[PDB]
Amino acid sequence: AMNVPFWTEEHVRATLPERDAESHKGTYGTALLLAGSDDMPGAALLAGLGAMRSGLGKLVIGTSENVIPLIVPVLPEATYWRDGWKKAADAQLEETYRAIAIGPGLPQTESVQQAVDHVLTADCPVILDAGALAKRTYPKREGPVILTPHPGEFFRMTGVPVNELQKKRAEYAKEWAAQLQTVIVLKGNQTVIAFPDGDCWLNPTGNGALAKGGTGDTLTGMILGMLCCHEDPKHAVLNAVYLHGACAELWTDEHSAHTLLAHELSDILPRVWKRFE
Amino acid sequence: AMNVPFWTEEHVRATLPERDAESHKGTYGTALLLAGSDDMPGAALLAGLGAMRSGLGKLVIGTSENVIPLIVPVLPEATYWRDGWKKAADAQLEETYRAIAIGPGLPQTESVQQAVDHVLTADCPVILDAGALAKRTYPKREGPVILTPHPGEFFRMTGVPVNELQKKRAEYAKEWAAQLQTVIVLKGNQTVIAFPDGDCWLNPTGNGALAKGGTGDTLTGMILGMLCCHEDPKHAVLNAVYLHGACAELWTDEHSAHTLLAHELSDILPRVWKRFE
Amino acid sequence: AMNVPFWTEEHVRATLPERDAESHKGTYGTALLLAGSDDMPGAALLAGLGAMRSGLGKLVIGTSENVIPLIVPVLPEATYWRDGWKKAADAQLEETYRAIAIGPGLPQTESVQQAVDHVLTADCPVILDAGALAKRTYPKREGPVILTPHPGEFFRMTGVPVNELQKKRAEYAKEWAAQLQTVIVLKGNQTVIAFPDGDCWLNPTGNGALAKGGTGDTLTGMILGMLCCHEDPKHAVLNAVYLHGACAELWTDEHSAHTLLAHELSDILPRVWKRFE
Amino acid sequence: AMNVPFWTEEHVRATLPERDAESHKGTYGTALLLAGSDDMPGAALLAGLGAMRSGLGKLVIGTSENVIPLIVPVLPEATYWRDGWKKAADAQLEETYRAIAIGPGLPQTESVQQAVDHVLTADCPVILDAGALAKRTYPKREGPVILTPHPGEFFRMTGVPVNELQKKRAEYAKEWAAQLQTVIVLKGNQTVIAFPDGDCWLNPTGNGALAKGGTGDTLTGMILGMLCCHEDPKHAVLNAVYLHGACAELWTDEHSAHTLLAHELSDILPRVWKRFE
Ligand SMILES: [Mg+2]
Ligand SMILES: [Mg+2]
Ligand SMILES: [Mg+2]
Ligand SMILES: [Mg+2]
């Protein structure tokens, strides 16, 4: 209705970064992932895998102490900030991170919002997902704030009912990205990527294989990693959403759309990303 | 002897659901799996994997607290109800589920039957397996109750000795499905799927690769997921049994029937299901 | 020197069992594996995987309590006897098993020999490996006792020094199998399988990829499973040793012999066994 | 600038060892890996996998007690020295090892240096990495000491700033290998392998896929294993560095360089090593 353009293959190809011979892991930065609670532990593994697959140099996972042992055997490349999402409620971040994500597998509590307030004082891009998504405003800061709501979370954030939202997804996403001065990745078929400067795109990739628990956690991780290897954070977000969807399309070539598990998106990404190089 | 028809490839093809572009995980529902105990933990992983592979939107696993960490690294897409099968002995279910399964890896105790009585007060289809199978009757309710006994469990449920049962499997399955007003999936070579309205089918797929611990737990999970993505729960049961067997047949093309592990059925399902689309 | 015959492909093909359509897991029996200690936990996973891959119907692992959680995510098809190898020091076995193995990952202690004495009172074939191997004699019983020493363990058992043993491996293996009235699988290149009735064979398969920790634990498990699906326990032992070696040969077709991990033998077995059907 | 030669394919082919038919795991020795702490557990899994993949006979991992359970399900072939890196601060090594590595995932503390002093009293080659790298000297002993610093660790060791180091990498590596009488593997694009007798080579393999956390831990493990199967420890180091890089090059044939996880290098090595045989 607003003729929002698709972020196409051509755009992805033109903007994906090189990983040059003369680089070291510092070139690609350290990401912080604040995710996973004793009650919802898997989200940290999913987002962790997505992040480390997506071109960062190092990952620190600030998860609950009891979640750490669940990640290690699957993602032994990650390091930890023990009870980090909880500690961030109380402490300013001491360390410098290339990018931060908070919220997958975290409860919708006031302490999580305290952590969010502290995350927002760093200079880097920050992603808020899942339990970090609330009805609130955001402080003026340097780096972008990227919100990743599904339609129900968008309702929690705005009071726009899901049935109204779905009739005018790009119009609402654009309006609220402007009002909040945040990026909004409004999930669903034809995910909307709305920027606070008024740019907006639709994602052309993906299918119903994604309509299952965990695929959003994987996407948050993918955005986090891509923020570390792209110079332009806008391109990071757009490429992450695109490639995430593309992985589901590769899956359905030889596998039923009913049968995908989110972690497999991460396993598919290496070959899918190669195709766009 | 009763000329029970086979649920054939043609029937599977005609009844498997589409996963359309405009869907979200809510379309495909949340399943509850009440399974796995400290003493028999693996059943929860097997049934969990089968369920999430089989087209549901979300899975909540109500397992023993000490089992949770064993599932997470393999199935990070699942969420949990801590000690859920035990809590269900005491509590009415508060939440609405698309479908429920109870029993894999659970002991044959009175408290498990208390949990079963509570599960039966929800409106959705319910599967009872393994330790949830007992000599008992069932209350009139909306959704179907699906019992998944092997011949020894059928003896526990009915007093029909296994040696007599095996001479007349479909006749006994049909008779007892009618008497109990439950679906009965009577396992074995040529698994019988008997409905309480008198419909009955045989399953034409599978082989002796299935004759090993865990393959029934996988099947319970597969039924659970398929109940979430099929509109007709009868077709869900029949397709789950069929596809489960078909996975074992794909296995034996290049692998010895002596060497299958149940979890691999779940790993095979994505490609097998595609073939029937 | 004694012209001991090789157990050849032809012999394997003629003796491997069918897994027929009309079977159930009971047909193929329940095995008990008494293995794995807090100090040497991996042996239980390796032997467990080998056993469940090798045609049994059910596996009960009697391992240390703290080892159980390490097995479940890899082998969720196994069930447990908590602290079973320790409990067997004190208790007669109550249950009937198709076959039993004891010793992988267990210490060389008197309590382990107490467990061995109790295992030997069951009627089934029994395998003794690793910490269960000691200088001792064996009581007259029905089923065979199968000892699986490497040359150093054979020295512990007999006082034959390794340097003398290695000059006359089949002569010593045959002599001691007769003296002890046990089967002796004397490991190494050209593994000797010596029976107490005087039959003896050499194994023609395998290579130096096997010369690394864990491959013997895998073999013990393979013998355990094959004892469950072969009518003739002699053929079970001989086929297990043969197929174990054959898996290492398949590996080295496209992978360096320096790089095999024991668990991969179990992963290779499905395709290797198919070739001999 | 100093015309340092590359360690080429031809050199690798001429020096890689055979794994002969008549070998046993003792032929290839027992390695000790002192790695992994509660705070940095993954390094032990990465280095463990690299070591066991690289032609040793047995591996003992002296890791923190709470790390052990994280390794077992992935590497069940390893055995353990519980809290071994900590115990080595206090105890002379009692056992004889073919080679030792210390430091991946260990903190930069005085107690770790105490452990290093004890490790250095064994006769075998020893690798120091990560937290074991400090500004210090080394005692005259038989076997080589192999330091594996990245440029920041080289600064910690020498006071040569990273920006100066990077202009003259081979000159600084050679100078400091001579001064310390240690091997120095100075990591980065064109890794420098400097020997204390003045030999020095550059590594021609690898790419930016390696520029991510964990790949150095994998390399330490690879050196450790190769020290066990090569007669000449110089060739072990050079081949480990070469093959590690070659694995990343194989990866990038069909996968994006941004998406490699360190553990996959270990999974690739079997096929890559075969190519050089
Ligand atoms: Mg989400
Ligand atoms: Mg069952
Ligand atoms: Mg052994
Ligand atoms: Mg390092």
Side-chain angles (χ1 to χ4, degrees), chain B residues 38-39 41-42 45-46 70 74 189 208 211-213 251-259 261-264, chain C residues 17-25 28 52-53 55-57 69 72-73 76-77 82 270-271 273-274 277:
Chain B
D38 287 0
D39 288 346
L45 180 45
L46 290 170
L70 315 180
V74 180
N189 178 49
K212 190 180 299 171
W251 175 259
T252 53
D253 284 348
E254 298 197 292
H255 311 85
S256 171
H258 290 294
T259 70
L261 301 172
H263 68 92
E264 295 174 310
Chain C
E18 270 192 79
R19 210 169 180 87
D20 98 297
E22 324 291 356
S23 50
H24 49 295
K25 71 190 77 62
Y28 301 101
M52 298 210 77
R53 280 286 192 208
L56 55 63
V72 176
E77 304 77 12
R82 189 173 294 272
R271 289 184 164 278
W273 191 326
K274 177 72 180 181
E277 289 185 336

Short mmCIF file of all heavy atoms in Angstrom, two decimals, chain B residues 38-39 41-42 45-46 70 74 189 208 211-213 251-259 261-264, chain C residues 17-25 28 52-53 55-57 69 72-73 76-77 82 270-271 273-274 277:
data_model
loop_
_atom_site.label_atom_id
_atom_site.label_comp_id
_atom_site.label_asym_id
_atom_site.label_seq_id
_atom_site.Cartn_x
_atom_site.Cartn_y
_atom_site.Cartn_z
N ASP B 38 13.45 -39.02 36.24
CA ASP B 38 14.88 -39.08 36.53
C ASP B 38 15.35 -40.46 36.20
O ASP B 38 16.46 -40.69 35.74
CB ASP B 38 15.18 -38.77 38.01
CG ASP B 38 15.00 -37.30 38.37
OD1 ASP B 38 14.66 -36.47 37.52
OD2 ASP B 38 15.24 -36.97 39.54
N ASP B 39 14.46 -41.41 36.41
CA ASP B 39 14.82 -42.78 36.13
C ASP B 39 14.76 -43.15 34.62
O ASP B 39 15.50 -43.99 34.16
CB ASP B 39 13.88 -43.75 36.91
CG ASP B 39 14.12 -43.79 38.42
OD1 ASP B 39 15.14 -43.31 38.94
OD2 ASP B 39 13.26 -44.38 39.10
N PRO B 41 14.89 -40.82 31.52
CA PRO B 41 14.93 -39.46 31.02
C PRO B 41 14.82 -39.38 29.48
O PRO B 41 14.31 -38.41 28.91
CB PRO B 41 16.30 -38.96 31.47
CG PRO B 41 17.13 -40.22 31.70
CD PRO B 41 16.14 -41.27 32.15
N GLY B 42 15.41 -40.36 28.79
CA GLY B 42 15.53 -40.29 27.34
C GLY B 42 14.25 -40.19 26.59
O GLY B 42 14.17 -39.58 25.52
N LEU B 45 13.39 -36.69 25.54
CA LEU B 45 14.11 -36.18 24.42
C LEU B 45 13.56 -36.77 23.11
O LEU B 45 13.35 -36.07 22.13
CB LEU B 45 15.60 -36.48 24.55
CG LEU B 45 16.46 -35.97 23.41
CD1 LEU B 45 16.16 -34.48 22.96
CD2 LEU B 45 17.99 -36.04 23.88
N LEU B 46 13.31 -38.08 23.14
CA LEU B 46 12.82 -38.75 21.93
C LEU B 46 11.45 -38.21 21.50
O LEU B 46 11.21 -37.92 20.30
CB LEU B 46 12.79 -40.25 22.14
CG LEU B 46 14.15 -40.91 22.24
CD1 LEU B 46 13.97 -42.35 22.70
CD2 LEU B 46 14.87 -40.88 20.78
N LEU B 70 19.21 -32.16 30.04
CA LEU B 70 19.55 -33.19 29.10
C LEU B 70 18.91 -33.00 27.76
O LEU B 70 19.39 -33.55 26.76
CB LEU B 70 19.23 -34.58 29.69
CG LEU B 70 19.70 -34.74 31.13
CD1 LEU B 70 19.31 -36.16 31.61
CD2 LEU B 70 21.16 -34.39 31.32
N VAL B 74 20.15 -30.63 22.82
CA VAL B 74 19.71 -31.33 21.61
C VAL B 74 18.47 -30.69 20.95
O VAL B 74 18.38 -30.70 19.71
CB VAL B 74 19.38 -32.79 21.93
CG1 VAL B 74 18.89 -33.57 20.67
CG2 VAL B 74 20.61 -33.51 22.57
N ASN B 189 4.32 -54.93 14.00
CA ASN B 189 4.19 -55.09 12.55
C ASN B 189 2.68 -54.97 12.21
O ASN B 189 1.84 -55.47 12.95
CB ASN B 189 4.71 -56.45 12.14
CG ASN B 189 4.57 -56.71 10.63
OD1 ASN B 189 4.93 -55.88 9.84
ND2 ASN B 189 4.00 -57.86 10.26
N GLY B 208 11.65 -54.26 10.93
CA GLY B 208 12.23 -54.65 12.21
C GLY B 208 13.27 -53.71 12.76
O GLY B 208 13.70 -53.84 13.93
N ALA B 211 12.15 -52.32 15.99
CA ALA B 211 12.04 -53.22 17.14
C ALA B 211 13.20 -53.01 18.11
O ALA B 211 14.06 -53.89 18.30
CB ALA B 211 11.98 -54.70 16.65
N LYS B 212 13.24 -51.82 18.71
CA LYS B 212 14.31 -51.44 19.61
C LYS B 212 13.80 -50.30 20.47
O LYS B 212 12.96 -49.49 20.00
CB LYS B 212 15.56 -50.97 18.83
CG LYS B 212 16.81 -50.79 19.69
CD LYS B 212 18.05 -50.33 18.88
CE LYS B 212 18.51 -51.34 17.75
NZ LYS B 212 19.57 -50.68 16.89
N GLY B 213 14.29 -50.25 21.70
CA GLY B 213 13.89 -49.17 22.60
C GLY B 213 13.94 -47.78 22.05
O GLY B 213 14.92 -47.40 21.42
N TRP B 251 15.68 -45.68 6.08
CA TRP B 251 16.88 -46.10 6.75
C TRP B 251 17.46 -47.38 6.15
O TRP B 251 18.66 -47.47 5.87
CB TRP B 251 16.62 -46.33 8.25
CG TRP B 251 17.80 -46.89 9.02
CD1 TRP B 251 18.00 -48.19 9.40
CD2 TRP B 251 18.94 -46.17 9.50
NE1 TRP B 251 19.15 -48.31 10.11
CE2 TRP B 251 19.73 -47.09 10.22
CE3 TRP B 251 19.31 -44.83 9.51
CZ2 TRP B 251 20.88 -46.72 10.87
CZ3 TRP B 251 20.46 -44.46 10.13
CH2 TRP B 251 21.25 -45.40 10.81
N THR B 252 16.63 -48.39 5.96
CA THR B 252 17.14 -49.71 5.58
C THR B 252 17.58 -49.79 4.12
O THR B 252 18.17 -50.78 3.70
CB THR B 252 16.14 -50.84 5.92
OG1 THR B 252 14.85 -50.54 5.36
CG2 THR B 252 16.06 -51.01 7.42
N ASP B 253 17.37 -48.71 3.35
CA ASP B 253 17.87 -48.69 1.98
C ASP B 253 19.41 -48.82 1.94
O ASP B 253 19.95 -49.54 1.10
CB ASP B 253 17.49 -47.42 1.26
CG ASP B 253 16.03 -47.37 0.81
OD1 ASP B 253 15.31 -48.38 0.82
OD2 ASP B 253 15.60 -46.26 0.42
N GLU B 254 20.09 -48.13 2.85
CA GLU B 254 21.54 -48.10 2.87
C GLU B 254 22.17 -48.44 4.22
O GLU B 254 23.39 -48.43 4.34
CB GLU B 254 22.05 -46.76 2.38
CG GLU B 254 21.64 -46.45 0.96
CD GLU B 254 22.49 -45.35 0.38
OE1 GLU B 254 22.37 -44.21 0.83
OE2 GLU B 254 23.30 -45.64 -0.48
N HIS B 255 21.33 -48.79 5.18
CA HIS B 255 21.80 -49.10 6.54
C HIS B 255 21.14 -50.38 7.04
O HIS B 255 19.99 -50.66 6.75
CB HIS B 255 21.44 -48.02 7.53
CG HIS B 255 21.80 -46.64 7.08
ND1 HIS B 255 20.98 -45.88 6.27
CD2 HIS B 255 22.91 -45.89 7.30
CE1 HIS B 255 21.57 -44.72 6.02
NE2 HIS B 255 22.75 -44.70 6.62
N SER B 256 21.87 -51.17 7.82
CA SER B 256 21.27 -52.39 8.37
C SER B 256 20.14 -52.13 9.32
O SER B 256 20.23 -51.24 10.19
CB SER B 256 22.34 -53.21 9.12
OG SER B 256 21.73 -54.29 9.84
N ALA B 257 19.08 -52.92 9.21
CA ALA B 257 17.95 -52.80 10.12
C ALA B 257 18.31 -53.04 11.59
O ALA B 257 17.58 -52.62 12.46
CB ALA B 257 16.85 -53.83 9.71
N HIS B 258 19.42 -53.69 11.86
CA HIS B 258 19.83 -53.93 13.22
C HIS B 258 20.37 -52.70 13.91
O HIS B 258 20.51 -52.69 15.16
CB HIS B 258 20.93 -54.97 13.26
CG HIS B 258 20.47 -56.35 12.92
ND1 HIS B 258 19.59 -57.05 13.72
CD2 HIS B 258 20.73 -57.13 11.85
CE1 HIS B 258 19.36 -58.24 13.18
NE2 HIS B 258 20.04 -58.31 12.05
N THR B 259 20.66 -51.66 13.16
CA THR B 259 21.53 -50.55 13.67
C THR B 259 20.87 -49.18 13.85
O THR B 259 21.52 -48.24 14.27
CB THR B 259 22.71 -50.37 12.71
OG1 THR B 259 22.26 -49.83 11.45
CG2 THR B 259 23.48 -51.66 12.48
N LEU B 261 18.93 -46.13 15.50
CA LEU B 261 18.59 -45.55 16.83
C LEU B 261 17.35 -44.67 16.63
O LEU B 261 17.22 -43.95 15.66
CB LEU B 261 19.76 -44.75 17.36
CG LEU B 261 21.05 -45.54 17.53
CD1 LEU B 261 22.24 -44.62 17.88
CD2 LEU B 261 20.88 -46.62 18.62
N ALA B 262 16.43 -44.74 17.59
CA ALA B 262 15.13 -44.09 17.46
C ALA B 262 15.22 -42.64 17.07
O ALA B 262 14.41 -42.16 16.29
CB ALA B 262 14.37 -44.21 18.78
N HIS B 263 16.13 -41.90 17.68
CA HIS B 263 16.22 -40.46 17.35
C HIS B 263 16.48 -40.17 15.90
O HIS B 263 16.09 -39.09 15.42
CB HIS B 263 17.22 -39.68 18.19
CG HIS B 263 18.66 -40.02 17.94
ND1 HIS B 263 19.46 -39.36 17.03
CD2 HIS B 263 19.44 -40.97 18.52
CE1 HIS B 263 20.66 -39.92 17.02
NE2 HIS B 263 20.69 -40.86 17.94
N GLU B 264 17.11 -41.10 15.17
CA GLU B 264 17.36 -40.92 13.78
C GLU B 264 16.09 -40.89 12.97
O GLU B 264 16.06 -40.31 11.87
CB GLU B 264 18.35 -42.00 13.30
CG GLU B 264 19.70 -41.80 13.96
CD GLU B 264 20.68 -42.89 13.67
OE1 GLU B 264 20.34 -44.09 13.81
OE2 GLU B 264 21.83 -42.52 13.29
N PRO C 17 22.58 -62.27 11.35
CA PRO C 17 21.15 -62.61 11.51
C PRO C 17 20.26 -61.66 10.72
O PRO C 17 20.67 -60.54 10.39
CB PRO C 17 20.95 -62.37 13.03
CG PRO C 17 21.85 -61.28 13.32
CD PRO C 17 23.11 -61.62 12.57
N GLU C 18 19.05 -62.12 10.43
CA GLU C 18 18.01 -61.30 9.80
C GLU C 18 17.25 -60.58 10.86
O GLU C 18 17.32 -60.95 12.03
CB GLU C 18 17.07 -62.17 8.97
CG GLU C 18 17.53 -62.31 7.53
CD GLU C 18 16.47 -62.93 6.62
OE1 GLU C 18 15.52 -62.21 6.19
OE2 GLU C 18 16.59 -64.13 6.32
N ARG C 19 16.67 -59.43 10.53
CA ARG C 19 15.78 -58.80 11.51
C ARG C 19 14.39 -58.85 10.94
O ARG C 19 13.99 -57.95 10.19
CB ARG C 19 16.17 -57.35 11.78
CG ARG C 19 15.82 -56.91 13.24
CD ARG C 19 16.46 -55.60 13.51
NE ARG C 19 16.20 -55.06 14.86
CZ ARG C 19 16.90 -55.32 15.95
NH1 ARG C 19 17.97 -56.04 15.94
NH2 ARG C 19 16.53 -54.78 17.10
N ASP C 20 13.62 -59.85 11.30
CA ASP C 20 12.44 -60.10 10.48
C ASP C 20 11.29 -59.15 10.82
O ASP C 20 11.25 -58.57 11.92
CB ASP C 20 12.05 -61.60 10.49
CG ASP C 20 10.96 -61.91 11.45
OD1 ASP C 20 11.19 -61.72 12.66
OD2 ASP C 20 9.88 -62.38 10.97
N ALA C 21 10.39 -59.01 9.86
CA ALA C 21 9.19 -58.16 9.91
C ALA C 21 8.35 -58.38 11.15
O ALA C 21 7.82 -57.42 11.75
CB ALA C 21 8.33 -58.43 8.67
N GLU C 22 8.22 -59.64 11.55
CA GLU C 22 7.32 -60.03 12.64
C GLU C 22 8.01 -59.97 14.01
O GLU C 22 7.57 -60.60 14.95
CB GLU C 22 6.76 -61.46 12.42
CG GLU C 22 6.46 -61.88 10.99
CD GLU C 22 5.29 -61.16 10.33
OE1 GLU C 22 4.59 -60.34 11.00
OE2 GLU C 22 5.05 -61.44 9.12
N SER C 23 9.11 -59.24 14.15
CA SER C 23 9.80 -59.18 15.44
C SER C 23 9.36 -57.98 16.29
O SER C 23 8.70 -57.04 15.81
CB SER C 23 11.32 -59.17 15.23
OG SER C 23 11.69 -58.19 14.28
N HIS C 24 9.67 -58.05 17.57
CA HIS C 24 9.46 -56.92 18.47
C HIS C 24 10.71 -56.80 19.29
O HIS C 24 11.59 -57.66 19.23
CB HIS C 24 8.22 -57.13 19.38
CG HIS C 24 8.18 -58.46 20.07
ND1 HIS C 24 8.05 -59.65 19.38
CD2 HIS C 24 8.25 -58.79 21.38
CE1 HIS C 24 8.08 -60.66 20.24
NE2 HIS C 24 8.18 -60.16 21.46
N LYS C 25 10.84 -55.73 20.05
CA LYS C 25 12.15 -55.53 20.73
C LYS C 25 12.52 -56.70 21.68
O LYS C 25 13.70 -57.05 21.82
CB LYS C 25 12.19 -54.22 21.44
CG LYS C 25 11.34 -54.10 22.68
CD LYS C 25 11.34 -52.63 23.07
CE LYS C 25 10.41 -51.84 22.16
NZ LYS C 25 9.02 -52.33 22.30
N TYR C 28 14.79 -59.42 20.48
CA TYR C 28 16.22 -59.13 20.45
C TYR C 28 16.83 -58.87 21.81
O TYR C 28 18.02 -58.53 21.89
CB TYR C 28 16.50 -57.96 19.50
CG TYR C 28 16.01 -58.29 18.14
CD1 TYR C 28 14.80 -57.77 17.69
CD2 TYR C 28 16.67 -59.28 17.36
CE1 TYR C 28 14.30 -58.12 16.47
CE2 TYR C 28 16.13 -59.65 16.12
CZ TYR C 28 14.96 -59.05 15.70
OH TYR C 28 14.35 -59.37 14.50
N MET C 52 23.86 -50.42 21.40
CA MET C 52 22.54 -50.12 20.82
C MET C 52 22.59 -50.12 19.30
O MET C 52 21.60 -50.42 18.62
CB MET C 52 21.96 -48.81 21.39
CG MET C 52 21.74 -48.91 22.88
SD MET C 52 20.37 -47.89 23.43
CE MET C 52 18.99 -48.87 22.92
N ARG C 53 23.78 -49.83 18.72
CA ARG C 53 23.96 -49.95 17.30
C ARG C 53 23.98 -51.41 16.80
O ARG C 53 23.87 -51.62 15.57
CB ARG C 53 25.29 -49.29 16.89
CG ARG C 53 25.24 -47.79 16.76
CD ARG C 53 24.52 -47.37 15.51
NE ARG C 53 24.70 -45.94 15.23
CZ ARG C 53 23.81 -45.19 14.58
NH1 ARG C 53 22.64 -45.68 14.19
NH2 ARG C 53 24.05 -43.91 14.35
N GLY C 55 22.11 -54.30 17.34
CA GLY C 55 20.98 -55.21 17.14
C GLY C 55 20.28 -55.78 18.35
O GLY C 55 19.47 -56.67 18.22
N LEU C 56 20.56 -55.25 19.54
CA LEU C 56 19.79 -55.57 20.71
C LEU C 56 18.37 -54.99 20.65
O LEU C 56 18.01 -54.26 19.70
CB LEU C 56 20.54 -55.15 21.97
CG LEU C 56 21.00 -53.70 22.13
CD1 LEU C 56 19.78 -52.74 22.18
CD2 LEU C 56 21.80 -53.51 23.39
N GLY C 57 17.53 -55.37 21.59
CA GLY C 57 16.18 -54.80 21.68
C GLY C 57 16.13 -53.65 22.68
O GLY C 57 15.53 -52.58 22.43
N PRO C 69 23.71 -38.43 33.16
CA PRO C 69 23.40 -37.20 32.37
C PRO C 69 24.30 -36.95 31.15
O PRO C 69 23.95 -36.19 30.25
CB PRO C 69 23.46 -36.08 33.42
CG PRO C 69 24.24 -36.61 34.51
CD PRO C 69 24.01 -38.07 34.57
N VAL C 72 22.70 -39.50 28.21
CA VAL C 72 21.32 -39.23 27.72
C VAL C 72 21.21 -38.39 26.44
O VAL C 72 20.56 -38.81 25.51
CB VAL C 72 20.42 -38.68 28.83
CG1 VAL C 72 19.00 -38.30 28.31
CG2 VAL C 72 20.33 -39.68 30.00
N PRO C 73 21.95 -37.27 26.34
CA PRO C 73 21.78 -36.43 25.15
C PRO C 73 22.33 -37.06 23.91
O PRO C 73 21.88 -36.73 22.78
CB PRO C 73 22.63 -35.17 25.47
CG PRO C 73 22.96 -35.27 26.91
CD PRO C 73 22.75 -36.62 27.39
N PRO C 76 19.68 -41.24 23.83
CA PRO C 76 18.47 -41.15 24.63
C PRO C 76 17.63 -42.45 24.63
O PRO C 76 16.68 -42.60 25.36
CB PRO C 76 17.70 -39.99 23.92
CG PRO C 76 18.20 -39.99 22.54
CD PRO C 76 19.66 -40.32 22.68
N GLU C 77 18.03 -43.44 23.82
CA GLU C 77 17.34 -44.73 23.75
C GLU C 77 17.68 -45.70 24.89
O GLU C 77 16.99 -46.68 25.08
CB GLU C 77 17.66 -45.40 22.39
CG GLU C 77 17.30 -44.53 21.14
CD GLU C 77 18.22 -43.40 20.78
OE1 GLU C 77 19.35 -43.31 21.31
OE2 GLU C 77 17.85 -42.68 19.80
N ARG C 82 20.62 -47.06 38.17
CA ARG C 82 21.47 -46.05 38.80
C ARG C 82 22.52 -46.70 39.73
O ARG C 82 22.14 -47.46 40.64
CB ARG C 82 20.53 -45.08 39.56
CG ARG C 82 21.13 -43.86 40.13
CD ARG C 82 19.99 -42.91 40.69
NE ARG C 82 19.17 -42.44 39.57
CZ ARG C 82 19.42 -41.34 38.86
NH1 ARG C 82 20.35 -40.46 39.23
NH2 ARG C 82 18.67 -41.06 37.79
N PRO C 270 26.28 -48.77 10.71
CA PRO C 270 25.03 -48.98 9.91
C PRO C 270 25.27 -49.25 8.44
O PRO C 270 24.68 -50.19 7.86
CB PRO C 270 24.31 -47.65 10.08
CG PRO C 270 24.66 -47.26 11.53
CD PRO C 270 26.15 -47.60 11.58
N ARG C 271 26.16 -48.48 7.83
CA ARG C 271 26.42 -48.67 6.38
C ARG C 271 27.30 -49.89 6.10
O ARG C 271 27.10 -50.60 5.10
CB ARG C 271 27.07 -47.40 5.79
CG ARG C 271 26.17 -46.24 5.67
CD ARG C 271 26.88 -45.04 4.97
NE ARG C 271 25.86 -44.08 4.55
CZ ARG C 271 25.12 -44.18 3.44
NH1 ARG C 271 25.29 -45.18 2.61
NH2 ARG C 271 24.19 -43.27 3.19
N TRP C 273 27.58 -52.68 7.99
CA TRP C 273 26.79 -53.90 8.22
C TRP C 273 25.88 -54.18 6.99
O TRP C 273 25.81 -55.30 6.55
CB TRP C 273 26.00 -53.75 9.52
CG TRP C 273 25.32 -54.98 10.08
CD1 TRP C 273 24.76 -56.03 9.39
CD2 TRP C 273 25.11 -55.24 11.46
NE1 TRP C 273 24.21 -56.93 10.28
CE2 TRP C 273 24.41 -56.45 11.56
CE3 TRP C 273 25.44 -54.55 12.63
CZ2 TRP C 273 24.05 -56.99 12.80
CZ3 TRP C 273 25.07 -55.07 13.83
CH2 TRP C 273 24.39 -56.30 13.92
N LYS C 274 25.26 -53.15 6.41
CA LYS C 274 24.40 -53.31 5.24
C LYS C 274 25.12 -54.04 4.09
O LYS C 274 24.53 -54.86 3.37
CB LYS C 274 23.90 -51.93 4.76
CG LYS C 274 23.03 -51.96 3.49
CD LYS C 274 21.63 -52.55 3.80
CE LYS C 274 20.71 -52.61 2.60
NZ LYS C 274 19.35 -53.16 2.93
N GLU C 277 25.01 -57.86 4.18
CA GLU C 277 23.69 -58.45 4.19
C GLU C 277 23.35 -58.96 2.79
O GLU C 277 24.11 -58.72 1.84
CB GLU C 277 22.64 -57.42 4.77
CG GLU C 277 22.83 -57.20 6.27
CD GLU C 277 21.76 -56.27 6.95
OE1 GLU C 277 21.15 -55.42 6.17
OE2 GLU C 277 21.50 -56.44 8.23
#
